[PDB]
Structure formats: C-alpha cells, structure tokens
Amino acid sequence: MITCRDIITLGLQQARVVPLGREPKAKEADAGLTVLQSIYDSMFADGPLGPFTEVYATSAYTAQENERIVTNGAAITIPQTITEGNETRKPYDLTAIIVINGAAQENHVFSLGRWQTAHDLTLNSEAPLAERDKAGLAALFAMEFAEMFGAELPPRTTARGFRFKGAISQKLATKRDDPVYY
Amino acid sequence: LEARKQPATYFNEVKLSIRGLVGVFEQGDSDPRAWPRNPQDEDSADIATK
C-alpha cells in the first residue's frame, strides 16, 4: 500500500532538497498535501480522465461509465461487473465515475482491477493509480512543487513525468483492432 | 493473403478469350455432304449424303 506520504517523501528527495534517508518535517509534508490534492482534483474536473456525461436521477440508479452523477438524495452504487449480453466483463482501464451530492464530491477511477478512491486524500490513505509506477508519479508531483523551494527538476527525470501524464492521457495499453482493408 | 486480412481478388480475363472463340466455331456449324467427282453415273451414287 503506497501511502500519500511516500510520494511526498520521494518527491522531495527527487528534487534534492531533503537528503537521502531523512524524512520531511511537519510544515513541509503538510503543504505538499494540499498541492497533491490539487493535481488529483484537476484531473476529474477537466483533464485527461475523459469527457463526462450529465445525468440527474433521484432514484436507486446504478452508475455507468464516465457519468457524473449529481443526485441529491439517492443510493448510487458503482458497478463491479458489467453484463453486455453475457459478455460479463470488468470496466475499461482508466474510466472514471463522479457522484456529487449537495456539497461533497466523490470521484472514482478503475485502474488495474480495483476502484481507486481519490477524494479527501489524507496523509495515510493510499494514492490512486500509483501502482502503475511510483517514481513517475513523484516526478509529476515534484515538477512544480519544487518551485516554492529554490531547486527544480533535472531534465533526465522531468521527461519521465511527462511520460506518465501521457500514459494516462491516451489509454493505449488495451489492445485494439487492426486496419481492415475495407 | 488471409494473414494480412486482405481479400483475394482475381480478374478472370481468360474466360473472355475462350468464350468468344468457341462461339465462332459454335455458330458456323455444318451438316455433311458428298461430292461426286465426275458426273458419269456418280451423282446417282450420292444417296450417301441423304
């Protein structure tokens, strides 16, 4: 379970501001939480997690793919399996679900067989979609978080983070069909 | 060709060259006939073509 504070510890010694083996202090590892929350929250709003579909139902509705639920009082259940004519499949890789009550947003994302949670992301909870790589997610974090300090990231590891942002902005992992010769 | 997912097209341009060449022979057909070589009692023996 890769916690949130493992990224901020890896992110800070990535930009060589804390040394190897020592941990961040209290004021350093609590300003990094508000900016690591901001990058995860700006991916469901309008970013590489795909466009969303509006819906307004006040009933026992179950959510579909890529659908932003804005119900007021209801029971919205995120599906685990989907049966498209006995094609009992799991959902696609990196497709999100938003549920919005009166004032509380709860985003969701399905990355490698598990629904990550990605809201109210505290210092103990696991980071969403960091199982794909750990040292790539700490370079996209520390790319702009290091600017409040003096330092900046070197170019051999800056372009590592721009690969991770493009590896989830394309969803090119799942195999698709060949050209057709029609 | 099936491993490239390609159709296997052919342009059968060798049936055209035979179908119109049999049709020349087939139209100009013939019934047989015997020709008496000298008309001194040889046309009377041309019952053979009948």
What is chain B's alpha carbon radius of gyration, rounded to the nearest angstrom? 26
CA quadruple A117, A98, A172, A87: dihedral positive or negative?
Answer: positive
Contact partners, residue A75, CB within 8 Å, separation at least 6 = A60
- Cα(A20)–Cα(A12) distance, integer angstroms: 10
Q: To the nearest whole angstrom, how far is the Cα of A115 from the nearest Cα of chain B?
A: 38
Q: To the nearest whole angstrom, how far is the Cα of A167 from the nearest Cα of chain B?
A: 29
Q: How many CB atoms lie within 10 A of CB A103?
A: 5
Q: What is the 3-state secondary structure (H, E, C) of A74-122?
A: CCCECCCCEECCCCEECCCCCCEEEEECCCCEEEEEECCCCEECCCCCC
DSSP assignment string, chain A: --BHHHHHHHHHTTTTSS-TTPPP-TTHHHHHHHHHHHHHHHHHSSSTT---EEE---SS-B--TTEEE--SS---B--S-EESSS-EEPPPTT-EEEEE-SS-EEEEEE-SSSEE--SS--SSSBPTT-SS-STTHHHHHHHHHTTSSS----HHHHHHHHHHHHHSSS---S--PPP---
Q: Which resolution in angstroms does this entry have?
A: 3.8
Residue of B nearest to A181 (CA): B6
Q: Are A29 and A42 in contact (CB under 8 A)?
A: no
User: Taking CA A63 as the corner, what is the angle to CA A61 and CA A65, rounded to the nearest 5 degrees?
Assistant: 155
Tokens of A92: 């696609």
Q: Which residues of A touch B7 (CB under 8 A)?
A: 181
Q: Are A136 and A161 in contact (CB under 8 A)?
A: yes
Place of tokens 């067989």: A113
Q: Are A48 and A172 in contact (CB under 8 A)?
A: no
Give the determination technique: cryo-EM
Q: Which residues of A touch B6 (CB under 8 A)?
A: 181
- Cα(A80)–Cα(A78) distance, integer angstroms: 7
Give the orientation angle of helix A4-12 with respect to helix A137-145, to 10 degrees: 60
- Cα(A163)–Cα(A52) distance, integer angstroms: 24
